Amino acid sequence: PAKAAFDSLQASATEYIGYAWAMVVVIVGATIGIKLFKKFTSKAS
Amino acid sequence: PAKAAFDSLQASATEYIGYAWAMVVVIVGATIGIKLFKKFTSKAS
Numbered sequence: 001p002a003k004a005a006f007d008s009l010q011a012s013a014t015e016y017i018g019y020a021w022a023m024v025v026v027i028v029g030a031t032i033g034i035k036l037f038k039k040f041t042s043k044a045s
Numbered sequence: 046p047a048k049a050a051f052d053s054l055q056a057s058a059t060e061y062i063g064y065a066w067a068m069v070v071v072i073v074g075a076t077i078g079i080k081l082f083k084k085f086t087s088k089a090s
Contacts, residue, residue: 002082009086 002078005082005086009090013090
């Protein structure tokens with residue numbers, strides 16, 4: 001029982017890591033994009 | 046008669062001790078296993 005329990009728990013943890021990574025990638029890309037747009041547009045002009 | 050009676054009684058008691066020990070070993074192993082699984086899985090996560 002411990003075998004299956006721990007294996008399923010690890011698999012679920014890995015999937016959750018995957019979804020979390022996708023979401024943080026999206027969020028971080030958006031925030032760095034807005035910051036870079038602000039900085040470049042402000043300084044270059 | 047007392048010789049045989051007491052010897053048979055002691056032998057039967059010893060066998061009963063054996064079966065009882067086997068059963069308690071199984072039960073205690075199971076309960077400690079479930080408790081340890083709960084504790085480790087809860088804390089480690």
